Amino acid sequence: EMVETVCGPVPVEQLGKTLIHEHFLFGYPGFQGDVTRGTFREDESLRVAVEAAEKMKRHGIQTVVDPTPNDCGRNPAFLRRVAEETGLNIICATGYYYEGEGAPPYFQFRRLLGTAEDDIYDMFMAELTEGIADTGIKAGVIKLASSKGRITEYEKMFFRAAARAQKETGAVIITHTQEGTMGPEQAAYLLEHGADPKKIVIGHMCGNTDPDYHRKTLAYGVYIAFDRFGIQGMVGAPTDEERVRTLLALLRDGYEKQIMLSHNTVNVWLGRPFTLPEPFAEMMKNWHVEHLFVNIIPALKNEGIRDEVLEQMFIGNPAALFS
Amino acid sequence: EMVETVCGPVPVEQLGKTLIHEHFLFGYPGFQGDVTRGTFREDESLRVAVEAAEKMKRHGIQTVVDPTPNDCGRNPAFLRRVAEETGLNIICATGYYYEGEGAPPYFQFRRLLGTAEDDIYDMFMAELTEGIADTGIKAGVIKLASSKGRITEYEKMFFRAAARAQKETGAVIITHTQEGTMGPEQAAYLLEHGADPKKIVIGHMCGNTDPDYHRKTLAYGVYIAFDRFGIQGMVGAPTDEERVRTLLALLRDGYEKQIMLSHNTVNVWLGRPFTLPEPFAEMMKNWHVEHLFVNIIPALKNEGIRDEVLEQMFIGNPAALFS
Ligand SMILES: CCCC(=O)N[C@H]1CCOC1=O
Ligand SMILES: CCCC(=O)N[C@H]1CCOC1=O
Ligand SMILES: [Fe+3]
Ligand SMILES: [Fe+3]
Ligand SMILES: [Zn+2]
Ligand SMILES: [Zn+2]
Numbered sequence: 001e002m003v004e005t006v007c008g009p010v011p012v013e014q015l016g017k018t019l020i021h022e023h024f025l026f027g028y029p030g031f032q033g034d035v036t037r038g039t040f041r042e043d044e045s046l047r048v049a050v051e052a053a054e055k056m057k058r059h060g061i062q063t064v065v066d067p068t069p070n071d072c073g074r075n076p077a078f079l080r081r082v083a084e085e086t087g088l089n090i091i092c093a094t095g096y097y098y099e100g101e102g103a104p105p106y107f108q109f110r111r112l113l114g115t116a117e118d119d120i121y122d123m124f125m126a127e128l129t130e131g132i133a134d135t136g137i138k139a140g141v142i143k144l145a146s147s148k149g150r151i152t153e154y155e156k157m158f159f160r161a162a163a164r165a166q167k168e169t170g171a172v173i174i175t176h177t178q179e180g181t182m183g184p185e186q187a188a189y190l191l192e193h194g195a196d197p198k199k200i201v202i203g204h205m206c207g208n209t210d211p212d213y214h215r216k217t218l219a220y221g222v223y224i225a226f227d228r229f230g231i232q233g234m235v236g237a238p239t240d241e242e243r244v245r246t247l248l249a250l251l252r253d254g255y256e257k258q259i260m261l262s263h264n265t266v267n268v269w270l271g272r273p274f275t276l277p278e279p280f281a282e283m284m285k286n287w288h289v290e291h292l293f294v295n296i297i298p299a300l301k302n303e304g305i306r307d308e309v310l311e312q313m314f315i316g317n318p319a320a321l322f323s
Numbered sequence: 324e325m326v327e328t329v330c331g332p333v334p335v336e337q338l339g340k341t342l343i344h345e346h347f348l349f350g351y352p353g354f355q356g357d358v359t360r361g362t363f364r365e366d367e368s369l370r371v372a373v374e375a376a377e378k379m380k381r382h383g384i385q386t387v388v389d390p391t392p393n394d395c396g397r398n399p400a401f402l403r404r405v406a407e408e409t410g411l412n413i414i415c416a417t418g419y420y421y422e423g424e425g426a427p428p429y430f431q432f433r434r435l436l437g438t439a440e441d442d443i444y445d446m447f448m449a450e451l452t453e454g455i456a457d458t459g460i461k462a463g464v465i466k467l468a469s470s471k472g473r474i475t476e477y478e479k480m481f482f483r484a485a486a487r488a489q490k491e492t493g494a495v496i497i498t499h500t501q502e503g504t505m506g507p508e509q510a511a512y513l514l515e516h517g518a519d520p521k522k523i524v525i526g527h528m529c530g531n532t533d534p535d536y537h538r539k540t541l542a543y544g545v546y547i548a549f550d551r552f553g554i555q556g557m558v559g560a561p562t563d564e565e566r567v568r569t570l571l572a573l574l575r576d577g578y579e580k581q582i583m584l585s586h587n588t589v590n591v592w593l594g595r596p597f598t599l600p601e602p603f604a605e606m607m608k609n610w611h612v613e614h615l616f617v618n619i620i621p622a623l624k625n626e627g628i629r630d631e632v633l634e635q636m637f638i639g640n641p642a643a644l645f646s
Pocket of ligand 3: 176177204
């Protein structure tokens with residue numbers, strides 16, 4: 001029926017063509033400490049974010065899910081500015097990043113007080129059903145994240161609280177997997193705690209190039225996201241050629257109704273500007289919001305993937321997920 | 324001669340009685356993500372901070388050093404509001420917390436880009452000599468922090484940059500030591516890189532109850548701070564009785580000109596309010612800004628410590644340190 005967006009409730013039937021994982025803003029925890037050299041340029045960032053939105057619109061995209069974690073610079077009022085400007089539906093998340101690159105000290109301390117897991121659940125419920133801060137914006141998804149080869153004790157608090165919140169709210173869960181690990185483990189743990197597989201997207205699955213790993217995850221009935229197209233040679237990521245090979249295998253094996261695609265772009269980096277060193281720069285040059293539509297999709301079509309299959313992924317699947 | 328305070332340059336001769344380590348505000352990294360349930364109450368926090376300042380003033384304190392790390396909610400304009408209100412001199416810091424409870428992902432990423440250590444030096448220089456953000460406030464100290472039993476590779480970037488900045492600026496360095504470890508190692512590493520021991524305070528030394536450890540550190544010519552009076556049974560801290568025993572040994576051994584005292588209070592916690600569980604609550608009940616003056620000092624006097632020795636610690640030493 002309905003999903004909460006940064007502009008309020010929208011009928012799921014009107015989401016249309018959707019990108020399941022992109023970031024308008026993103027900062028690595030600690031960016032706040034580099035304020036003198038890395039101040040947030042409100043108006044300039046908005047122009048940049050708005051242009052990204054317009055680029056997506058030119059390729060038919062009507063909706064973007066931006067699951068920026070709470071501890072990584074999430075800014076719903078900023079997202080609303082983008083939406084009010086461009087007409088794009090933007091759905092935001094409630095949740096924390098994984099332990100390795102997130103900001104665990106705060107909830108690790110509350111865990112010592114013995115209230116962390118309850119406090120996280122309370123946060124999820126407030127942001128799903130009441131509003132984020134004083135913005136009046138509700139999250140439409142819960143974001144979860146795990147570490148390489150482990151769901152840590154810290155991370156597990158969020159997993160359990162997320163399952164609890166989903167049972168109460170029906171909210172969609174979208175996950176981060178680190179370096180192609182823990183996909184099946186995330187699904188099985190969430191389902192153990194009562195989560196609904198039809199409301200779960202296991203993310204960054206494109207980080208693993210073994211189709212058997214994908215099938216192991218898909219067996220749980222969840223969605224999987226190939227959501228890092230364009231990211232090559234960093235964060236342990238495979239090449240797009242490898243992503244495409246893996247994707248083609250799964251589509252030809254009939255898994256179209258469980259797969260979604262995205263880039264995981266960061267359109268505005270929080271903190272101090274930087275330039276990637278030439279090694280990484282070249283490999284990452286295709287990491288932008290138009291990449292799927294100008295490079296990947298054409299390659300898929302040339303490989304015989306039909307328009308109806310593409311439509312299932314970009315339109316059909318997000319509609320089912322949120323409805 | 325002069326030191327930068329949150330209200331501009333002040334003659335070091337007018338610092339008077341000083342507390343070397345207290346926090347008006349402090350949050351564990353990740354507090355930002357708990358904004359819905361943990362919003363910062365600007366006006367209420369100011370009242371609380373101002374009352375803390377007034378309590379200190381009633382015991383003769385004229386100056387407080389607040390070394391809240393950049394990644395732990397440092398807010399110089401807020402400190403200025405307190406100072407403009409109460410007349411208290413407040414000196415603030417530039418620096419990041421230790422790896423375990425700080426926010427390393429940001430500079431760990433820049434380390435991958437190969438610019439982190441240079442960027443940290445640039446930050447220190449900007450905040451020491453130009454101003455923090457657009458506040459116009461300059462830091463008067465560089466804050467450094469190390470982990471339990473290790474100065475990590477992450478932490479070392481800050482240590483090296485701090486030594487580099489001190490050589491250029493003459494800024495005072497104040498450190499955090501974790502669970503009574505690395506005191507001698509911090510001094511030796513800073514001195515290796517050209518830092519001036521007469522401009523260094525090794526902090527949280529009260530966390531170690533072996534006077535030989537203290538002497539090992541003192542041998543470098545640095546200051547040491549017994550700066551966590553009131554903290555008992557948490558963060559691996561000893562009891563105040565143990566702190567006093569250790570302190571008495573060092574004073575009776577003639578180290579008065581190298582020792583400073585403080586509480587490390589957190590007067591306003593950032594994020595969601597909390598209550599310590601009864602075990603910790605009782606042990607921590609003396610953790611407040613008046614504790615040194617109403618409990619510890621009287622105990623020292625009863626142990627025969629003379630007024631001139633107390634004056635050396637609270638007045639003489641900070642004057643020498645900053646001049
Ligand atoms: C800049 C190299 C690519 C990269 O760091 N991607 C990161 C940014 C935010 O989510 C990611 O996966
Ligand atoms: C609340 C228990 C005591 C504690 O956590 N102290 C912390 C707060 C900030 O610097 C510290 O040393
Ligand atoms: Fe991710
Ligand atoms: Fe400390
Ligand atoms: Zn992402
Ligand atoms: Zn402190």
